[PDB]
């Protein structure tokens, strides 16, 4: 067919949906009925289930009326139409609204009459402290495979500011993670810092080890390991922790998250927490 035989009446679908001029029950009344000749008309209700709420809403408008590709069985047709949006919507005109837009409509031909079959728009859009830093790290943990384990890796390059692989231990990792924000701490942050550099207050002391009081912990709590403070970790919920584990002589294993059940033996009970409001 000439794709016009759809796009001439997809223009009804435009004016009945992507344009609303000044927007009220009266505009809506015709912009419903003019669809009930051209939807798979049960689908006109499926269009009522997108409607403006007047007093909150005013005209949403189709400017940059772009459209693109088709594919056709012969007489039943799929088409993509990137009909962009402009929108000025009552006091949502003290700041307007905007959209990118993309619509793969589908259509069929029955007794020469048209119907419209995929209702579709994809509206497209261009418009705590310790815990938050821990959640960010959890979310980005799978993308940080460039960071590698070493015993006392103290590189001068920031791991997050470089695509190149780099060997960092847990203390330097913590330092780089906190350095990204307004706080600085003090390098290399060997075990001393937690005592003489004052940023922390202990939650649980060393020498006692209770498995029932683990649930009371919170995400971002620093978890120690080893009998002589050999390694440390960051706590995350669901009974897990984030650390690097591997053979001692510079293992190639990247950073990863392990269950606490197997490592619970070497936990040593020491737990600490950050505080930034009162320091200096």
């Amino acid at each position: 067919a000439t794709d016009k035989e759809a796009k001439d009446v997809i223009d009804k679908f435009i004016d009945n949906v992507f344009n609303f001029d000044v927007l009220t029950k009266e505009r809506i009344k015709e912009k419903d009925e003019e669809i009930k000749k051209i939807t798979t008309d049960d689908m006109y209700e499926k269009v009522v289930y997108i409607r403006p709420y007047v007093g909150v809403i005013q005209s949403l408008n189709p400017q940059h009326v772009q459209y693109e590709s088709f594919s056709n069985n012969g007489y039943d047709i799929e088409a993509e139409l990137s009909f962009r949006k402009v929108s000025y919507l009552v006091d949502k005109g003290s700041i307007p609204t905007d959209s990118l837009s993309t619509l793969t409509v589908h259509l069929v031909e029955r007794n020469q009459e048209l119907l419209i079959d995929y209702f579709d728009e994809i509206q497209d859009v261009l418009y705590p402290l310790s815990t938050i830093l821990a959640l960010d790290l959890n979310d980005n943990l799978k993308s940080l495979s460039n960071i590698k384990y070493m015993f006392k890796g103290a590189p001068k390059e920031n791991p997050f500011g470089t695509d190149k692989d780099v060997y960092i231990d847990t203390y330097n990792l913590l330092y780089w993670l906190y350095l990204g924000e307004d706080e600085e701490l003090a390098y290399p942050m060997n075990i001393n810092y937690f005592f003489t550099e004052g940023r922390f207050f202990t939650i649980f002391g060393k020498g006692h080890k209770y498995k029932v009081d683990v649930s009371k912990f919170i995400v971002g709590d620093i978890l120690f390991f080893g009998r002589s403070d050999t390694n440390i970790g960051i706590y995350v919920g669901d009974g897990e922790f984030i650390s690097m584990m591997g053979k001692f002589p510079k293992d190639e294993t990247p950073i990863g998250k392990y269950k606490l059940d197997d490592y619970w033996n070497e936990f040593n009970g020491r737990v600490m927490r950050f505080d930034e409001e009162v320091y200096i």
């Binding site: 499926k46 009522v48 289930y49 997108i50 409607r51 403006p52 709420y53 007047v54 007093g55 909150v56 809403i57 949403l60 949006k85 929108s87 919507l89 959209s99 209702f119 728009e121 994809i122 509206q123 859009v125 705590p128 815990t131 938050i132 959640l135 979310d139 649930s215 919170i218 995400v219 919920g237």
Partner: protein
Amino acid sequence: LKKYNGKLPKHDPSFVQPGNRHYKYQCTWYAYNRRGQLGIPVPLWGDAADWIGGAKGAGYGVGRTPKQGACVIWQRGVQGGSPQYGHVAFVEKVLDGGKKIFISEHNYATPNGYGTRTIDMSSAIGKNAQFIYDKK
């Protein structure tokens, strides 16, 4: 989830629940789906107002109390929600400790109801709304 100390896990443009029975583009659909980012699905009602009576039948709690993420329901035909089908939002953060809430996924006359707003619970919009409290 209160075990996350009030950090909310990921925001989500693209998730999909098996609780899917009605049009995948309703305000109420974005609501049952994003309530799955909290891992707590509900049996469907198309009308948001039906969720109140449905929550009593399905064995949930109901009232006006804010908690992080949990849905706010506007009943049909009040300041903040249309008369046809009712209206809903998901509550990312509770501000002040009651009087403001930050909301998301919200359709309220929003063509494609992605968006965000701050609601005064001091004024009619937040006083008209209702919270479910979910079961175990």
